[PDB]
Design a protein around this ligand. Structure first.
Ligand SMILES: Nc1ncnc2c1ncn2[C@@H]1O[C@H](COP(=O)(O)OP(=O)(O)OP(=O)(O)O)[C@@H](O)[C@H]1O
Ligand SMILES: Nc1ncnc2c1ncn2[C@@H]1O[C@H](COP(=O)(O)OP(=O)(O)O)[C@@H](O)[C@H]1O
Ligand SMILES: [Mg+2]
Ligand SMILES: [Mg+2]
Ligand SMILES: [Mg+2]
Length: 346
C-alpha cells in the first residue's frame, strides 16, 4: 500500500524540530544584521543567505541532542584574483570575536558558530564577475528571493527572481541572467578559489520538487533517514549532498506518491548504474550548479558499489511494501526500511 498519511507522519517525525528551526532562522537574521552594520565589513559584504539542506528542506533531524548543520553563505565583492580565500576569511575574525566570543572556530574552508540549538557553517564567497554583470548579480543576492530564511517547503511560490516577493505569479528569472554565474569559495583543503552555485542548486531543487508534485524533497529526507537507520550495513559514503544528488538524479519527473517514488527511484538507480556497478566503478555526475564539477569526485568506487548493493536490497523491501494489500503488513515492510519513526496505521 502507498500509506500516504503514514508517510506524511513519518516526514513530520524526521524534519528538524520547531526549536531548531526557529533557532537557525533567528541566528541567520541576527548574523546578517550584525554583518550589515559592522563598519569594517560594511562595504565588502554583499549578502548573507541561508543555503544547504536546511534551505532546500532536505535536512533531517539529528539523533539524540546533536545540533543541526546550518549552512550560510556570505557573499563579498572582493577581487578573487588579488586576494586568496584565506585573505577573505581573515577579514571576519574581529567580527566573530566581537559578536560570538567563545562560540566560533575556523573549520578549514568555513567558520563554525555554535548557537543554542544549531551549528552555523559559514562559507565566505566572492563574485568573479565585474562591472555591470557584477552589479546585476549583487542585486539578485540582495533580493528577497535570496534573503528569505524560510525553506523551500514553506514557500512553494518561491522562484529565483529578484522581483519575487513572499506570499504573505512570477517565474524563475531567465537562465541567461544566472546559470553561467557561480560564486567562488575556498577549496576544502587548499587555499585556492573553487566555483560553487548554491542559488542554481536551490532553484533546481525547487523545480524538481514542483515537477515531482512535492514529493522530491520528502523522498530525499526519507532516503537520508533510511541511510542513517541502516548505517551499519551501508558504506559511510555517499551521505549528505552527494546522496541528495544521487536521489534527485534517480527520481523521474511526475512522481505521484512517496511509495511509488521510492520504488521508481530505486529501480531506476539500479538499472541506470548496473553497468558501472559491473565495472566496479562509479558515475561521473554533473553538478546542477557548476556543470563541469563531478558531484561524486570524492566518492570511491568501492563505496559506490557497496551503496549500490544496499539500494538493491532496499528495493526488494520497498517493492514488497508497495505491493502489500494489507495496511499492517505494508507498514511493517516500510518500517524495515525506515525504523519506528514510520508509524503503524490505525
Ligand atoms: N560534492 C558536492 N557537490 C556539489 N555541492 C556540494 C558538494 N558538497 C557540498 N556541496 C554544497 O555545499 C552545501 C553544504 O554542504 P553540506 O555537507 O552541509 O551538505 P548538506 O546538503 O547541507 O547536507 P547535510 O544536511 O548533511 O548538512 C551542500 O548543500 C551543497 O550545496
Ligand atoms: N559549504 C559549502 N557551501 C557551498 N558550496 C560548497 C560547500 N562545500 C562544498 N561546496 C561545493 O562542492 C564542491 C566540492 O567540494 P568538496 O567536496 O568539499 O571538495 P573540494 O573543495 O576539494 O573540491 C565545491 O567546489 C563547491 O562547489
Ligand atoms: Mg549542511
Ligand atoms: Mg555544512
Ligand atoms: Mg531523473
Amino acid at each position: 500500500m502507498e500509506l500516504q498519511p503514514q508517510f506524511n507522519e513519518f516526514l513530520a517525525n524526521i524534519r528538524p524540530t520547531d526549536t531548531q528551526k526557529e533557532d537557525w532562522k533567528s541566528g541567520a537574521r541576527t548574523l546578517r544584521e550584525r554583518l550589515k552594520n559592522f563598519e569594517p565589513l560594511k562595504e565588502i559584504v554583499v549578502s548573507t543567505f541561508l543555503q544547504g539542506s536546511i534551505r532546500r528542506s532536505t535536512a533531517i533531524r539529528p539523533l539524540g541532542d546533536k545540533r543541526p548543520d546550518v549552512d550560510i553563505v556570505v557573499v563579498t565583492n572582493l577581487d578573487h584574483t588579488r586576494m586568496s580565500p584565506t585573505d577573505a576569511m581573515d577579514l571576519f575574525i574581529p567580527f566573530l570575536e566581537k559578536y560570538y566570543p567563545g562560540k566560533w572556530e575556523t573549520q578549514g574552508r568555513s567558520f563554525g558558530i555554535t548557537l543554542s540549538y544549531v551549528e552555523l557553517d559559514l562559507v565566505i564567497t566572492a563574485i568573479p564577475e565585474s562591472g555591470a554583470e557584477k552589479s546585476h548579480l549583487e542585486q539578485l543576492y540582495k533580493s528577497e528571493s535570496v534573503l528569505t530564511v524560510n525553506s523551500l517547503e514553506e514557500q512553494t511560490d518561491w522562484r529565483l527572481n529578484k522581483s519575487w516577493t513572499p506570499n504573505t505569479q512570477v517565474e524563475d528569472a531567465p537562465a541567461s541572467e544566472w546559470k553561467a554565474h557561480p560564486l567562488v569559495l575556498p577549496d576544502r583543503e587548499k587555499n585556492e578559489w573553487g566555483r560553487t552555485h548554491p542559488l542554481a542548486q536551490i532553484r533546481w531543487t525547487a523545480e524538481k520538487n514542483r515537477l515531482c508534485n512535492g514529493h522530491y524533497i520528502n523522498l530525499v529526507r526519507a532516503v537520508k533517514w533510511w541511510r542513517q537507520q541502516n548505517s551499519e550495513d551501508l558504506p559511510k559514503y555517499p551521505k549528505g549532498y552527494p546522496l541528495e544528488h544521487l536521489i534527485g538524479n534517480a527520481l523521474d519527473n511526475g512522481t505521484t506518491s512517496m511509495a511509488q517514488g521510492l520504488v521508481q527511484l530505486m529501480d531506476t538507480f539500479l538499472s541506470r548504474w548496473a553497468a558501472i556497478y559491473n565495472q566496479k566503478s562509479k558515475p561521473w555526475l554533473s553538478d546542477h550548479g557548476v556543470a563541469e564539477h563531478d558531484v561524486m569526485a570524492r566518492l570511491t568506487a568501492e563505496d559506490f558499489c557497496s551503496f549500490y548493493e544496499g539500494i538493491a536490497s532496499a528495493a526488494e523491501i520497498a517493492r514488497n511494501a508497495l505491493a502489500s494489500e494489507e495496511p499492517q503488513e505494508s507498514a511493517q515492510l516500510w518500517r524495515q526500511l525506515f525504523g519506528s519513526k514510520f508509524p503503524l496505521p490505525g
